[PDB]
Structures are given as structure tokens and as C-alpha cells.
Amino acid sequence: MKQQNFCVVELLPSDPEYNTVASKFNQTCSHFRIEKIERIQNPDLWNSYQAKKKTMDAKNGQTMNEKQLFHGTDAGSVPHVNRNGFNRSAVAYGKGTYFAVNANYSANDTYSRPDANGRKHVYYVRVLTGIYTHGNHSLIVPPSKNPQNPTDLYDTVTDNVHHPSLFVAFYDYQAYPEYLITFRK
Ligand SMILES: NC(=O)c1cccc(NC(=O)CCC(=O)NCCc2cn(CCNS(=O)(=O)c3cccc(C(=O)O)c3)nn2)c1
Numbered sequence: 183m184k185q186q187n188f189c190v191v192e193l194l195p196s197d198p199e200y201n202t203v204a205s206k207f208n209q210t211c212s213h214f215r216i217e218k219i220e221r222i223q224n225p226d227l228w229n230s231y232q233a234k235k236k237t238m239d240a241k242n243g244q245t246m247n248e249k250q251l252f253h254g255t256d257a258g259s260v261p262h263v264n265r266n267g268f269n270r271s272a273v274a275y276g277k278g279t280y281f282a283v284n285a286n287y288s289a290n291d292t293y294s295r296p297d298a299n300g301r302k303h304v305y306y307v308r309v310l311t312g313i314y315t316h317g318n319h320s321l322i323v324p325p326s327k328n329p330q331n332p333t334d335l336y337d338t339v340t341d342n343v344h345h346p347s348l349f350v351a352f353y354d355y356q357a358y359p360e361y362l363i364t365f366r367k
Pocket residue numbers: 252253254255256259260262263267268269270271272273277278279280281282287288289293294348349
């Protein structure tokens with residue numbers, strides 16, 4: 183809704199942006215080899231991401247609304263995620279998109295399924311986690327904060343509010359696949 187055409191830009195190992203991303207990945211995934219790291223440049227998707235962030239910022243106070251989190255997926259999904267991000271298109275904590283604090287969660291073969299050539303795919307994603315609570319299975323949206331004021335909902339949900347290892351997001355444009363890590367065993 184807008185075409186959200188994208189460019190994919192490989193970064194070189196010398197690039198500081200490469201190392202920022204590789205370093206975060208390497209905290210838990212050093213034992214894998216990284217074949218490449220790309221930036222996904224999709225200006226329509228980014229513009230719609232930045233619009234929801236502006237809204238979230240003007241609303242959540244001192245809160246750092248954005249976290250950078252990981253998401254493993256199969257090779258088939260990579261061009262979908264590039265065009266559309268994490269679109270509306272079951273589970274423990276709700277029916278939305280799952281993101282992980284630590285790369286080794288996403289690196290599991292059940293998420294980042296290895297292709298024919300053994301390549302695995304993990305995105306390093308800007309996610310608007312905002313204000314979060316503990317989730318549950320039947321959430322098709324996050325719960326309301328106050329029952330007296332029931333339209334202001336939580337922004338995301340999590341497994342553990344003081345020690346999260348995962349977050350679930352439900353809305354469109356709440357997440358931007360800024361980087362794709364292609365790697366192998
Ligand atoms: N993938 C990860 O790196 C990761 C990180 C933390 C936790 C988890 N996963 C879990 O704990 C269990 C995940 C699970 O059982 N189901 C989630 C999969 C799912 C997401 N959706 C939402 C539909 N929107 S969609 O466009 O098809 C979509 C959305 C987001 C990602 C994809 C994708 O291609 O990966 C697709 N429907 N099913 C994964």
C-alpha cells in the first residue's frame with residue numbers, strides 16, 4: 183500500500199556498522215560463521231516505521247521505545263520481510279511476531295531454518311517494544327492497561343517483564359528489518 187521496493191546493501195567487515203551488528207550477534211552466536219551482513223533499505227517501510235515511533239515517543243515519556251532484537255526465519259520469507267516487514271499475514275504469548283533478545287534464540291534451526299546450501303537467516307531488527315507486559319496465548323492484540331481507559335493498550339508483550347528473553351509485536355510497522363545476517367554452522 184505504496185510499493186515498498188527495497189535495496190539490499192552488503193556491508194564490508196571493515197565497516198563500523200558491520201562490527202556493531204556482528205558484535206551483538208557474536209555475544210551468543212560467535213561459534214557460527216557469518217558469510218554476510220546486509221542493510222535493507224526500504225524507504226516507504228522506514229517512513230511508516232518512523233511515523234509510529236514518533237507517536238510512541240510523544241506518548242511513552244522517558245521510555246526508550248525502540249529495541250534492537252533478532253528474528254530468525256527461513257529463506258523463503260526473506261523477500262517478504264524485505265518488502266513488507268512483519269505484516270499481518272497457536273503460541274505461548276500471543277498471535278503476532280516473535281523477536282529475541284539474544285541471537286542464539288533466533289539461530290535455532292526451527293526458526294532460522296537452513297536452506298539447501300546450509301545458510302541460516304537472522305534479521306537484526308528495530309522493534310518498538312514501548313511499554314510491555316507479560317503475555318498469554320489468546321492475545322490477538324496486547325491487553326489494555328487500565329479497564330477504565332481500555333483503548334490505551336500495552337505496546338508489546340513479553341515472557342518476563344524484568345528479565346525478558348523475547349517480545350511479541352502485533353501491529354504493522356512496529357518493526358523494521360534493518361539488517362539481515364546470513365551465516366552457517
Ligand atoms: N524467529 C525468532 O527469531 C524468534 C524469536 C523469539 C521467539 C520465537 N518464537 C517462538 O517463541 C515461537 C514462534 C511461533 O510459534 N509462532 C510465530 C510465527 C507466526 C507469526 N505470525 C504472524 C503473521 N504475520 S506474517 O507476515 O506471516 C509474518 C510475520 C512475522 C514474521 C514472518 C516471518 O516470515 O518470519 C512472517 N504468525 N505466525 C522466534
